[PDB]
């Protein structure tokens, strides 16, 4: 019974109405679908079980509707303390399955990244290997591309990257990206440059620099 | 009161991991992938006495049950690394209508062939490359280090605001790499000491690092 959740991401503003979709591929039996919230580094909460039936503490801005392979999950006013991921859950005559939740993210201003780079430090120069680290700081939508350039020859498949979560306080995102060079090859070259790309920049932005 | 889990786990493929979940209705044995979703394990009601399984899991996995019951994976793969929760879902009453969930701490299960290592705490230095303004960027990047997790503070904490600890990568080598950064004003990268403290328990090994530019 695979269930597919809608929409992937939604981008409300605290105060307004949130939708929240789980259709499923089969019947469900009958009253025997759940909702859960999660924010990061906690375990799921029960907000709603059975379709219908809500869940102790659970206040009434959440209600859950549906039946059949439609269900949905409706919050009236979105609180800042709403804003998380969410899954829905069958649990009779199954396998019991999930699904693969949905993203409740603050809309806010497009906001640009702070573009800083930041070269191997001497001790793990000393050590044998090599990592430049790109920062994005504080943007806003989460989606953002970097690209990094060794003498401008582009590299791939040796970077990686990570995001925060959306920051409490100005619901923006931050992302960093590590190069990981050899001692020899990081010797062997001089400029060493960033290039970021986002919505909110008029220009992509490069953050370069030499060695010495 | 509570579900209690066993504390976090590292296996070796092909190894097996017994959790074990010990109470204060059916217990459910979920898990969670880093960055994925939830996935359902398994189930085990003590009234028959028989657990119900996932066809997935069908071949390798054993649920049974003092009030403890425990989940043992078999034949553990990469894919297996995982937080791993029992659940209870039981009914209260109260103004006659009938709802609650409890949920165990979960419990780190980390397969790989990498063994435990403490992690390097270089300085990422502020420089003119990352000062926009009069606001500059600084940070400590921790690599090499396993398994999961590692905690980061800035000045014993005194410096939380501006501060971003990302989550951590897994390297082609099996070891997990990290970096914390903050941004501070740019007229303070002389008169004021910062220092990143790294904590990684799974091997004991703390860290305090200063981080100068130049």
């Known amino acids: 019974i695979v269930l597919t959740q809608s929409p992937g991401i939604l981008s409300l503003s605290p105060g307004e109405r949130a939708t929240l979709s789980c259709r499923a591929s089969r019947t469900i039996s009958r009253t025997h679908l759940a909702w859960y919230q999660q924010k990061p580094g906690q375990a799921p909460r029960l907000l709603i079980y059975?379709?219908?039936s809500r869940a102790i503490g659970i206040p009434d801005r959440f209600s859950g509707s549906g039946s059949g392979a439609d269900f949905t999950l409706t919050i009236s006013r979105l609180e800042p303390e709403d804003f998380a991921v969410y899954y829905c859950?069958?649990?009779?005559?199954?396998?019991?399955?999930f699904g693969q939740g949905t993203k409740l993210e603050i809309k806010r201003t497009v906001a640009a990244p702070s573009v800083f780079i930041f070269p191997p430090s001497d001790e793990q120069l000393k050590s044998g290997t090599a990592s430049v680290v790109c920062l994005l700081n504080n943007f806003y939508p989460r989606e953002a591309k970097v690209q990094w350039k060794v003498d401008n020859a582009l590299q791939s498949g040796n970077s990686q990257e990570s995001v925060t979560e959306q920051d409490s306080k100005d619901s923006t995102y931050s992302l960093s990206s590590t190069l990981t060079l050899s001692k020899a090859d990081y010797e062997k070259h001089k400029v060493y440059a960033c290039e970021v790309t986002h919505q909110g920049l008029s220009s992509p932005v490069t953050k370069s620099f030499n060695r010495g | 009161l509570q579900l209690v889990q066993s504390g976090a786990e590292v296996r070796k493929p092909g190894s097996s991991v017994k959790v074990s979940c010990k109470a204060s209705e059916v217990i459910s044995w979920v898990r969670q992938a880093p960055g994925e979703g939830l996935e359902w394990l398994g189930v085990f009601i003590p009234m028959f006495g028989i657990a119900d399984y996932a066809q997935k899991f069908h071949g390798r996995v054993t649920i049974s049950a003092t009030s403890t019951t425990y989940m043992e994976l078999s034949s553990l793969r990469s894919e297996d690394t995982a937080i791993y929760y029992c659940?209870?879902?039981?009914?209260?009453?109260?103004?006659?209508?009938?709802?609650?969930?409890?949920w165990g701490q979960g419990t780190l299960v980390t397969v790989s062939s990498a063994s435990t290592k403490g992690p390097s705490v270089f300085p990422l230095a502020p420089s003119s490359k990352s000062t926009s303004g009069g606001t500059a960027a600084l940070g400590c990047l921790v690599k090499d280090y396993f398994p999961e997790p590692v905690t980061v503070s800035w000045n014993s904490g005194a410096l939380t605001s501006g501060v971003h600890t990302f989550p951590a990568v897994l390297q082609s080598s099996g070891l997990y790499s990290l970096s914390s950064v903050v941004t501070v004003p740019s007229s303070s990268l002389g008169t004021q000491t910062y220092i990143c403290n790294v904590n990684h328990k799974p091997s004991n090994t703390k860290v305090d690092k200063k981080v100068e530019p130049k």
């Open positions: 059975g379709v219908s």
């Open positions: 659940a209870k879902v039981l009914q209260v009453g109260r103004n006659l209508v009938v709802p609650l969930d409890l």
């Open positions: 859950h069958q649990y009779g005559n199954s396998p019991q399955t």
